[PDB]
Design a protein around this ligand. Structure first.
Ligand SMILES: CC(=O)N[C@@H]1[C@@H](O)[C@H](O[C@@H]2O[C@H](CO)[C@@H](O[C@@H]3O[C@H](CO)[C@@H](O[C@@H]4O[C@H](CO)[C@@H](O[C@@H]5O[C@H](CO)[C@@H](O[C@@H]6O[C@H](CO)[C@@H](O)[C@H](O)[C@H]6NC(C)=O)[C@H](O)[C@H]5NC(C)=O)[C@H](O)[C@H]4NC(C)=O)[C@H](O)[C@H]3NC(C)=O)[C@H](O)[C@H]2NC(C)=O)[C@@H](CO)O[C@H]1O
Length: 365
């Protein structure tokens, strides 16, 4: 009994094949939870800015018709929403209450089962506001369920896997009460924003051999453990796994971890964004590359020419799943199913090779 919580996005629809994803591409039995990314906030109220908003509602109802066990949530936030997106809604209880009531009506009208708040990030400044908003939602949700024939709206949150960010942003014990679970964002541990600019893996399970001091923090094992230590019960920890990798353009001839990089990797042809590659792009890149499995860190990286791609593959799916079960975690979260090879047409491994491996690994006694 593990959750498989699957984020998907509303921007992947503008991609060319085979990055071209709509909710209609979703398998109703693939995951236990679906989270739509992202909603917006206009007039201290919840909306959806998506030209496919209405067809999405239609797909939601089809999905839940085919799988009555399926739970679909709505997410607010993300890296680009930032902290700014939550202003001015959080600035007072009045505007906050206006919001919380928009949410309840919204989710009921549209057949969502809860809400994800993935605020990136509260940090020091907004620690208080984030805490308060979560508590007011949690309470309003409970209150609403008091007067209901419906199951109660679930509340989750996408949270930092970064030690310092966790220290600055969260009151964990409070969070443990208010949230049904965290979606631990246990990736983006390394990437081309770093200084000094050196190759590093986006989502390492374990410590690197060269990791010392606060680099010892930048792995999944650590992140997960620190959350539990800070108060979050293990079963409320839902462990994020990525379907993308972080890329680097190599400065010199070192191809190792910690090798100097001139900048982010060449942009994928489909995701057109230098620094990362979806898995369906990674599979093309792997043709003619040399791949190394890191023993220390338990994940692969691939080199082809001056390109260095740290990524996650079927082998790390199964490896990460064993770890999360060993630690009695609540399950697995995926960012994002629409960057797996969902069509099956690039990796020739069937549809959703990575997520499918995760399902199987959780499902296996
Ligand atoms: C002060 C200082 O110097 N501090 C240093 C500091 O940098 C180090 O800490 C590290 O910082 C980095 C960067 O700030 C952190 O990286 C961020 O990590 C979070 C996770 O914690 C990421 O956000 C979530 O995760 C995914 C994957 O990255 C996010 O996905 C992105 O979402 C956006 C939308 O919001 C996507 O944009 C869309 O895509 C295209 C263009 O790319 C466009 O066409 C679309 O229209 C656009 N959509 C929208 C809505 O605008 C983007 O594609 C996508 N990326 C991918 C791969 O899918 C998602 O937003 C987040 N999910 C949820 C849920 O919230 C965040 O993306 C990521 N930022 C960057 C830049 O990659 C890092 O976590 C942090 N590390 C640690 C360990 O804490 C510290 C280290 O301590 O050192 C200091 O020195």
């Amino acid at each position: 009994s593990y959750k498989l919580v699957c984020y998907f996005t509303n921007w992947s629809q503008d991609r060319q094949e085979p990055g071209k994803f709509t909710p209609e591409n979703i398998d109703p039995f693939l995951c236990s939870h679906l989270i739509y990314s992202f909603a917006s906030i206009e007039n201290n109220k919840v909306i959806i800015k998506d030209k496919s908003e209405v067809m999405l509602y239609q797909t939601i109802n089809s999905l839940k018709t085919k799988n009555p066990k399926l739970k679909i949530l709505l997410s607010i936030g993300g890296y680009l929403f930032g902290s700014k997106g939550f202003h001015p809604m959080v600035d007072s209880s009045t505007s906050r209450l206006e919001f919380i009531n928009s949410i309840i009506l919204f989710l009921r009208n549209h057949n969502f089962d809860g809400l994800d708040v993935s605020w990136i990030y509260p940090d020091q400044k907004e620690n208080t506001h984030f805490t308060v908003l979560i508590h007011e939602l949690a309470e309003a949700f409970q209150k609403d369920f008091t007067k209901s024939t419906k199951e109660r709206l679930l509340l989750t949150v996408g949270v930092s896997a970064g030690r310092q960010m966790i220290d600055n942003s969260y009151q964990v014990e409070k969070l443990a009460k208010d949230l049904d679970f965290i979606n631990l964002l246990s990736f983006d541990f390394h990437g081309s924003w770093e200084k000094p600019l050196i190759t590093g893996h986006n989502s390492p399970l374990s410590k690197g051999w060269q990791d010392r001091g606060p680099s010892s923090y930048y792995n999944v094992e650590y992140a997960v453990g620190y959350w539990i230590h800070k108060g979050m019960p293990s079963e409320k920890v839902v462990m994020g796994i990525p379907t993308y990798g972080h890329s680097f353009t190599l400065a010199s001839a070192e191809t190792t971890v910690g090798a100097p990089a001139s900048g982010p990797g060449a942009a994928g042809p489909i995701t057109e964004s230098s620094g990362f590659l979806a898995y369906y792009e990674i599979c093309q890149f792997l043709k003619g590359a040399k791949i190394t499995w890191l023993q220390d860190q338990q994940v692969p990286y691939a080199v082809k020419g001056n390109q260095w791609v740290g990524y996650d593959d079927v082998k790390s799916m199964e490896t990460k799943v064993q770890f999360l079960k060993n630690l009695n975690l609540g399950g697995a979260m995926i960012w994002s199913i629409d960057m797996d090879d969902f069509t099956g047409k690039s990796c020739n491994q069937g549809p959703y090779p990575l997520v499918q491996a995760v399902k199987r690994s959780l499902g296996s006694l």
